[PDB]
Design a protein around this nucleic acid. Structure first.
Ligand SMILES: [Mg+2]
Ligand SMILES: [Mg+2]
Ligand SMILES: [Mg+2]
Ligand SMILES: [Mg+2]
Ligand SMILES: [Mg+2]
Ligand SMILES: [Mg+2]
Ligand SMILES: [Mg+2]
Ligand SMILES: [Mg+2]
Ligand SMILES: [Mg+2]
Ligand SMILES: [Mg+2]
Ligand SMILES: [Mg+2]
Ligand SMILES: [Mg+2]
Ligand SMILES: [Mg+2]
Ligand SMILES: [Mg+2]
Ligand SMILES: [Mg+2]
Ligand SMILES: [Mg+2]
Ligand SMILES: [Mg+2]
Ligand SMILES: [Mg+2]
Ligand SMILES: [Mg+2]
Ligand SMILES: [Mg+2]
Ligand SMILES: [Mg+2]
Ligand SMILES: [Mg+2]
Ligand SMILES: [Mg+2]
Ligand SMILES: [Mg+2]
Ligand SMILES: [Mg+2]
Ligand SMILES: [Mg+2]
Ligand SMILES: [Mg+2]
Ligand SMILES: [Mg+2]
Ligand SMILES: [Mg+2]
Ligand SMILES: [Mg+2]
Ligand SMILES: [Mg+2]
Ligand SMILES: [Mg+2]
Ligand SMILES: [Mg+2]
Ligand SMILES: [Mg+2]
Lengths: 23, 214, 37, 146, 177
RNA sequence: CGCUGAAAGCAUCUAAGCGGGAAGCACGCUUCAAGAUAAGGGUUCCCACAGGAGUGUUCCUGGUAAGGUCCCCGAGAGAUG
RNA sequence: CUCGAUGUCGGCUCGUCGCAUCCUGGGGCUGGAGUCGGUCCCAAGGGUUGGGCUGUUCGCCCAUUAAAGCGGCACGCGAGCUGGGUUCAGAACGUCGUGAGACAGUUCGGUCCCUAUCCGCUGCGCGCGGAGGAAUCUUGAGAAGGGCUGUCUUUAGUACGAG
RNA sequence: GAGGGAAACAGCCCAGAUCAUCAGCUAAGGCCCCUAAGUGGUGACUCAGUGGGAAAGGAUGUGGAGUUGCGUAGACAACCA
């Protein structure tokens, strides 16, 4: 799903270091 | 940008005629009375080309000082109504010029503009042609209801422009491509084949047909 | 014209070009016309 | 106590920028800075200390790449199917003032004061402006080294 | 740009004015004008020829080099000799006639005859009811006019009927074998 | 679908450029519209009142002009406005 | 996530959106003689019927039509309607159980309500402002509506085709 | 488990709030404007708004580094037998 894909891809932001709650 | 001929009149009513093919034609009778050019609008001073026409019989005690001064500058007697005609040939019009129904010939197509008859607050079934509910089969106090007016939690709202009840009538309506049946200028009568908006006695603007003809 | 993600030369006279950002195959034989899409 | 301007204490001036062949982004950033008065040591966010900006030749604003036909601007009337879209090139050709105001407003904070200050931006697509009485001084977009 | 690096020989009676980026070409047949793209310059090479120079050996430099060389050569060869294109019509009932050098009338099996106007630099010349030609001083304009005349009724792959180029290799098949 | 045309001595609808090309896009037609607080424009009318405080006059009271409303008779209008 | 309640099928009414286009518009390739077709692109402006059967969705059928599109919106829409289906207490049949009873087996019968506070939306006023107070006529930033299509005649029995 | 960063965003990153301070230095993250600080310096690459979502597969996109065949015994194209 689009929402799931965006949620998973949000972990690629700079301040996060490849990790994010709920992937 | 378009060159338009025009005149002002009053809706006197309707009757019927028989044309040369022995066809019954409904005709509206418009007292396309004498109109006077009260003001000419030019791009230099106003920014667009149009001609302001007068028309109307007015009582001398019902014309105020600003209106009286406007008519005095125009050089004409005061008129009740003032309506503009957006024409690209406004210049050819001189201040105080006389305009009569004979500006239209026996077979010109015209567009007639007037304010429609009012109906007050109308229901959906009348002002929008809504099919209501049935009269029987358990319909519960909603025989003339508008039905649903939206969806659900999405969009949890009523979309803008939904047709619901409101006040209908009294609005600018233009009916196009009406073929003038006859013009008798010596008494200012115009017979126009068709039905034009507004009650009897309303003001009508008769202009040359924008789309020329059918 | 065939619109396919995979466009290839079919005959020896077909020519592969890049027109307006799209890969196309132009040939004298009209059957071989192709465009990526 | 830190200094704070008092209403009409800071005197607001009039600048004029010739948008001739100047990138829209640089023009908008410069206009926003001038309108908010960020170049003044008397700056204060809560009091309008900026200057009036008159932009001329907005129809000749430079755009890079394929922006003139691929960079789109959208408006919505608030009703279903009420979207209109026009490219920035068409908008610069037709209503350049709208384009420049949109850019500057987007770059300016979202405030009641910012709404008030955006009225100080006078954008004209041609080379002539009617504010000779206000006597705008020419402003040159420059950079400070290092 | 192997094409571009070759020079352009100005012929007799041809006036080539290189006013910087903008260039005028006068000749017996008429006048043409053209602006070269900015990273390309043009020189006279002892006033008897034309040279175009790419300032760098990149792609756009070489591409505009070849383009400008070919296009300047085209304008000079046009003003010294012109441009000619021969169009022939096949199929019964198809005819072409001339109401002047710049006015053609086609009966290409349509309901009614069709009228073709020419631009100022385009002049027609018909010699046969089934063969005609177009001439001018601009190669691009002549080519597009011929293309439009063909587009009026392009050849078919059944009986060739249609306006075709003189050397056009029109394809053909058979339906009701 | 094209024209001219290189990069790539050719070719190529394309890289420079130009032309055609749909009930779609934007207009054309109709209607609303300056609360468009950016509050527009034309034309016309009325006019430098009076009395106080005053602190550049400021501002607050009072009678008017042009004009308008209330009230009354109505409808071509209208739930009431 | 909600069990100190987020009412669950189909129709009615009212729409709106997507395009993965049913018709109408345009174009390639085939083709295809023509006439037609079929397929890969474009394209969502408008239009997209009435009935028989069944609670039905679905589906089949009748008669049309340019066509009878596919989907989203709490399988749109019950503080809008419908209660035929579903899922209460009655009863019967079949099956199961020693029995009380059970059955996404079947059958007949079978209660709901709401004066709209807020947002939303359709209309209509009052106020204040528009740097004097007024009267009239206006510009249009911007907004909305509208956008369907057939048959016949003619070109012409012309083009095409062996007919 | 407040504070800073992640647009917002218990679980990610920085960092553990004794109170006051209109002092200074930093962390993560940042320095065109929103938004505090560089429209920083120098050298390359990209022209897809890639950057600012995705596969098998496909493609004379473009820069750079090889290996190798042929080539002024005259190569590859273009043009005459
Ligand atoms: Mg999926
Ligand atoms: Mg009924
Ligand atoms: Mg009842
Ligand atoms: Mg809500
Ligand atoms: Mg070619
Ligand atoms: Mg070609
Ligand atoms: Mg509760
Ligand atoms: Mg599509
Ligand atoms: Mg539809
Ligand atoms: Mg649309
Ligand atoms: Mg079924
Ligand atoms: Mg639907
Ligand atoms: Mg449902
Ligand atoms: Mg509900
Ligand atoms: Mg029941
Ligand atoms: Mg129930
Ligand atoms: Mg029995
Ligand atoms: Mg038993
Ligand atoms: Mg029952
Ligand atoms: Mg109610
Ligand atoms: Mg408008
Ligand atoms: Mg608005
Ligand atoms: Mg802890
Ligand atoms: Mg924390
Ligand atoms: Mg945070
Ligand atoms: Mg935060
Ligand atoms: Mg520091
Ligand atoms: Mg750091
Ligand atoms: Mg903020
Ligand atoms: Mg720099
Ligand atoms: Mg930099
Ligand atoms: Mg892309
Ligand atoms: Mg992207
Ligand atoms: Mg990828």
């Amino acid at each position: 799903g689009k929402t799931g894909r965006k949620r998973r891809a949000r972990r690629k932001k700079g301040a996060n270091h490849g990790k994010r709650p709920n992937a | 940008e378009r060159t338009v001929k025009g005149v002002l009149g009053t809706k006197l009513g309707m009757t019927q005629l028989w044309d040369e093919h022995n066809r019954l034609v409904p005709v509206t009778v418009i007292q396309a009375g004498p109109c006077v050019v009260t003001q000419v609008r030019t791009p230099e001073t106003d920014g667009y080309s149009a001609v302001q026409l007068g028309y109307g019989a007015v009582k001398a005690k019902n014309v105020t000082k600003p209106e009286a001064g406007h008519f005095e500058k125009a050089g004409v007697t005061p008129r009740r109504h003032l309506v503009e005609l957006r024409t690209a040939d406004a210049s050819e019009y001189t201040l105080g010029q006389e305009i009569a129904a004979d500006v239209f010939s026996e077979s010109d197509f015209v567009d007639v503009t007037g304010t429609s008859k009012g109906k007050g607050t109308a229901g959906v079934m009348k002002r929008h042609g809504f099919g209501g509910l049935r009269a029987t089969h358990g319909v519960h106090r909603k025989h003339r209801s508008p039905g649903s007016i939206g969806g659900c939690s999405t969009p949890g709202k009523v979309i803008k422009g939904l047709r619901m009840a409101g006040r209908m009538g009294v609005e600018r309506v233009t009916v196009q491509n009406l073929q003038v049946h006859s013009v008798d200028a010596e008494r200012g009568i115009m017979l126009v084949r068709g039905a034009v908006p507004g009650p009897k006695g309303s003001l009508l603007v008769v202009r040359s047909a924008a789309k020329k003809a059918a | 014209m065939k619109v396919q993600p995979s466009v290839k030369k079919i005959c020896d006279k077909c020519k592969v070009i890049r027109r307006h950002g799209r890969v196309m195959v132009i040939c004298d034989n009209p059957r071989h016309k192709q465009r990526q899409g | 106590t830190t200094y704070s301007p008092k209403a009409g204490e800071v005197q607001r001036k009039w600048y004029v920028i010739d948008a001739e062949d100047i990138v829209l982004g640089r023009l908008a950033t410069t206009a926003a800075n001038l309108l908010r008065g960020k170049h003044k040591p008397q700056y204060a966010p809560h009091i309008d200390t900026g200057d009036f900006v008159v932009v001329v030749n907005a129809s000749k604003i430079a755009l890079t790449g394929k922006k003139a036909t691929d960079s789109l601007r959208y408006d919505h009337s608030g009703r279903p199917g009420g979207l209109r879209v026009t490219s920035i090139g068409e908008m610069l050709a037709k209503n350049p003032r709208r384009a420049v105001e949109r850019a500057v407003w987007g770059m300016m904070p979202k405030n009641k004061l910012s709404r008030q200050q955006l009225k100080k931006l006078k954008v004209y697509g041609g080379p002539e402006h009617p504010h000779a009485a206000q006597n705008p001084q020419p402003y040159e977009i420059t950079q400070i080294a290092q | 740009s192997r094409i571009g690096r070759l020079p352009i020989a100005v012929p007799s009676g041809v006036e080539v004015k290189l006013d910087g980026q903008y260039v005028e070409v006068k000749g017996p047949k008429g006048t043409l004008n053209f602006t070269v793209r900015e990273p390309i310059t043009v020189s006279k090479n002892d006033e008897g020829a034309i040279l175009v120079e790419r300032p760098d050996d990149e792609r756009e430099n070489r591409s505009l080099h070849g383009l400008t060389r070919t296009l300047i050569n085209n304008m000079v060869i046009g003003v010294t000799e012109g441009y000619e294109k021969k169009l022939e019509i096949q199929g019964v009932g198809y005819r072409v006639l001339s109401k002047g050098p710049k006015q053609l009338e086609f009966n290409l099996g349509f309901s009614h005859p069709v009228i073709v106007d020419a631009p100022e630099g385009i002049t027609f010349a018909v010699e046969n009811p089934t063969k005609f030609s177009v001439q001018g001083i601009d190669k691009q304009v002549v080519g597009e006019t011929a293309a439009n005349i063909r587009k009026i009724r392009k050849p078919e792959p059944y009986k060739g009927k249609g306006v075709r180029y003189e050397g056009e290799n029109v394809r053909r098949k058979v339906g009701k074998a």
